[PDB]
């Protein structure tokens, strides 16, 4: 996060850290959606142009963290994955279309003050909150600069109008994507960055007071560059693939 602030304790209890066993290192963020299921960007697991092809055995999931590098004894829960599923039509060759993956935990995690799931939008939530102008929140332990936080950072950012998103890049934007950020004129900054990838873009429902994950930090061009924006996977448009894997 570039231009973010320190998260407060228990502000994002659904935030997960994707961690590499050896060499031990922060891979990406993810979010807890239930006691056994974690959601993240597919490019965190599989990205052939960079020789990235991570297996289940290769990682850990860390829940309830605040500190980026400390082992938060008695607070944090570290788990092992039972299974990884990537979207069958994920596009790593052209634009990262369908950048989404589910992780099945080898065993359920217990809820607590610091560990708690986020809601998945249903058609009417998405219809109402996914509006140009409406702010969402991104959290993560990534780079502070296009620079490593000591603690979980946060930033609130506006969703931008489809056309402005298209016009900012040469990359082919699909319907499973949405971009968010400040216009260079709005004179406000902030953005995901190296390490944040795969984390959540959440909004709070004005109707029931619940937090909903609307996007997944997917890609960008630099970090907090003027006139460029962050691209996020549209969780609702991929909602049936989600239900499907969980239910089968």
């Amino acid at each position: 996060i570039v231009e973010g602030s320190d998260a407060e304790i228990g502000m994002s209890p659904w935030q997960v850290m994707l961690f590499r066993k050896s060499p031990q290192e922060l891979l990406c963020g993810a979010s807890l959606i239930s006691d056994r299921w974690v959601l993240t960007a597919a490019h965190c697991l599989l990205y052939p142009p960079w020789d990235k092809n991570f297996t289940e055995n290769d990682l850990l999931v860390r829940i309830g963290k605040h500190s980026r590098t400390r082992y938060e004894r008695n607070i944090e829960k570290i788990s092992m994955l039972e299974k990884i599923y990537i979207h069958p039509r994920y596009n790593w060759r052209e634009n990262l279309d369908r950048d989404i993956a589910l992780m099945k935990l080898k065993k359920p995690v217990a809820f607590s003050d610091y560990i708690h799931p986020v809601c998945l939008p249903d058609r009417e939530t998405a219809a109402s909150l996914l509006q140009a102008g409406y702010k969402g929140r991104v959290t993560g332990w990534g780079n502070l600069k296009e620079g490593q936080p000591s603690v979980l950072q946060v930033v609130n950012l506006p969703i931008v109008e489809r056309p402005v998103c298209k016009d900012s890049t040469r990359i082919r934007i699909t319907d499973n994507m949405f971009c968010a950020g400040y216009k260079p004129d709005e004179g406000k900054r902030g953005d995901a960055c190296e390490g944040d990838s795969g984390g959540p873009f959440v909004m709070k429902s004005p109707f029931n007071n619940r937090w909903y994950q609307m996007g997944i930090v997917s890609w960008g061009e630099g970090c907090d560059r003027d006139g460029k924006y962050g691209f996020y996977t549209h969780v609702f448009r991929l909602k049936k693939w989600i239900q499907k894997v969980i239910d089968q």
Partner: peptide
């Protein structure tokens, strides 16, 4: 920079 984690976890 990462502090050591319990071995049970590997």
């Amino acid at each position: 920079d990462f502090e050591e984690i319990p071995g049970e976890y590997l």
